[PDB]
């Protein structure tokens, strides 16, 4: 009983407030595909999917205090470790001539420890998934490089890579699950370098108490108010 | 200078449970990793666990794991060992001991006695 | 597991007189990160462990200098340029490159009279 305008009329308010919190670049994108919805319902349902997944990656950056990268400026695995492990990157391609798909590979963040973008501590941010996922049962899956049964050690520093997957889906445990299962072969392929990588990934959706998100309660509500209820009108009307 | 002094030993029943400590001063405890080793009378040393510095690493031993726990309380530079449903050839000497910068055994404590036995 | 070989189970030794003792790896003790984390320790009669060599030729701090040791890969050795009579006592071989932290079984260095 409403034409596609009309849905974008009501939604100006809840989505002006969901442009002014993200960052430039997820603002900006999620403002082209708007007007695209505006004018466009597959093709609008479309649209409004990457709002959905453009929108949680930018509040997430934020809540995380990391930076949004837009999916054409994010790094590959094979650009990792090209940069960060370059005496490793020749032989990151022999072993990779059987799984060449590997190479290009591309997470929401690539990021690596201060010597890709750059993180702290790769353990702290480990450890914070960790204790949100047994403090509130919040499904999440992590993988760690392991070459051999080597230990750690504290007499030396090594570089090492973060990779993050997020996800804003009804299916979070089998996002969790399917994200684990594509980086494990990798991950295996790591350990044969001696390269340390870890690998995170985890999943919010609409049904998940608003307290008990990835991304602060405030950016929860700027994502209810609009990107949901545009959902809910779009296949109503 | 570098002290470990270790405290806790003494018999126990074969399914019993003890706790060991051990006292660190001469260095900054809470920045270095601590393990626990051992030695049954009359044979070898036995490494037993290992923790981290901000206890984020653990390792144990095989022959302990699910039974022992190793955990450090930082602003007390102390390092503990609880020891449940021991047996009999958990019969040794406790060690504490530090690489103070690596996960060599550089200093060790004088050892305390923990004999399993009914 | 990392078993570590130590050889000969006992050394005789004449005081003044040089020692090798030696320590054969299952598996390398490089470490991804380029060390090898192969050590020495002395443990004399009744007294705790002692380091002797760390990383497979660091000497510690304090440790007499007729001590040293060499080697890579799998294969390494300890030896006493020459014998003093403290030097008694049984001598073990530790790898912490891997995970569980291991040991030889002990070389017992005795004086030769």
């Known amino acids: 009983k409403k034409p596609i305008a009309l849905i974008c009329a009501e939604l100006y308010k809840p989505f002006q407030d969901l442009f002014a919190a993200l960052p430039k670049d997820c603002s900006e994108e999620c403002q082209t595909l708007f007007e695209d919805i505006r004018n466009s319902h597959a093709s609008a349902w479309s649209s409004a999917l990457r709002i959905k997944g453009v929108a949680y990656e930018g509040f997430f950056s934020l809540t995380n205090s990391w930076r949004y990268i837009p999916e054409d400026l994010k790094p590959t695995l094979g650009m990792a470790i090209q940069t960060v492990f370059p005496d490793k990157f020749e032989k990151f391609l022999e072993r990779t001539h059987l799984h060449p798909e590997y190479r290009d590979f591309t997470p929401a963040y690539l990021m690596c420890r201060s010597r890709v973008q750059e993180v702290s501590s790769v353990s702290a941010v480990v450890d914070r998934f960790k204790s949100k996922s047994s403090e509130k049962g919040r499904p999440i899956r992590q993988e760690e490089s392991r070459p051999k049964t080597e230990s750690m050690q504290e007499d030396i520093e090594v570089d090492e890579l973060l990779i993050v997957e997020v996800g804003y889906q009804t299916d979070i445990e089998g996002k969790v699950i399917s994200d684990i299962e594509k980086w494990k072969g990798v991950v295996n392929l790591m350990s044969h370098l001696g390269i340390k990588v870890n690998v995170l990934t985890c999943a919010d959706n609409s049904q998940t108490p608003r307290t008990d998100w990835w991304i602060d309660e405030k950016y929860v509500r700027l994502l209810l108010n609009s990107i949901s209820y545009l959902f809910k009108e779009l296949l109503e009307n | 200078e570098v002290k470990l002094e270790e405290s806790g030993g003494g018999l126990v029943r074969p399914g019993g449970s003890r706790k060991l400590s051990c006292a660190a001063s001469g260095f900054t405890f809470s920045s270095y990793g601590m393990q626990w080793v051992r030695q049954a009378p009359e044979k070898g040393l036995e490494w037993v666990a290992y923790?981290?510095?901000?206890?984020?690493?653990?390792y144990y031993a095989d022959t302990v794991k699910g039974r022992f726990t190793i955990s450090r309380d930082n602003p007390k530079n102390t390092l503990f060992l609880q020891m449940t449903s021991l047996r009999s050839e958990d019969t040794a000497m406790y060690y504490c001991?530090?690489?103070?910068?690596?996960?060599?055994?550089?200093?060790w404590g004088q050892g305390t006695l923990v004999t399993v036995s009914a | 597991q990392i078993v570590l070989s130590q050889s000969p189970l006992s050394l005789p030794v004449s005081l003044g007189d040089q020692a090798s003792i030696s320590c054969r790896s299952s598996?390398?003790?490089?470490?991804?990160?380029?060390?090898?984390?192969l050590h020495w320790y002395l443990q004399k009669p009744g007294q705790s462990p002692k380091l002797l060599i760390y990383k497979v030729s660091n000497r510690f701090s304090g440790v007499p200098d007729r001590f040293s040791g060499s080697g890579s890969g799998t294969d390494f050795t300890l030896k006493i340029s020459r014998v003093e009579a403290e030097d008694l006592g049984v001598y073990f071989c530790?790898?912490?490159?891997?995970?569980?932290?291991?040991f030889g079984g002990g070389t017992k260095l005795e004086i030769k009279r």
């Open positions: 598996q390398s003790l490089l470490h991804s990160n380029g060390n090898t984390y």
């Open positions: 530790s790898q912490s490159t891997h995970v569980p932290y291991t």
């Open positions: 001991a530090t690489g103070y910068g690596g996960t060599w055994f550089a200093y």
């Open positions: 923790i981290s510095s901000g206890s984020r690493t653990i």
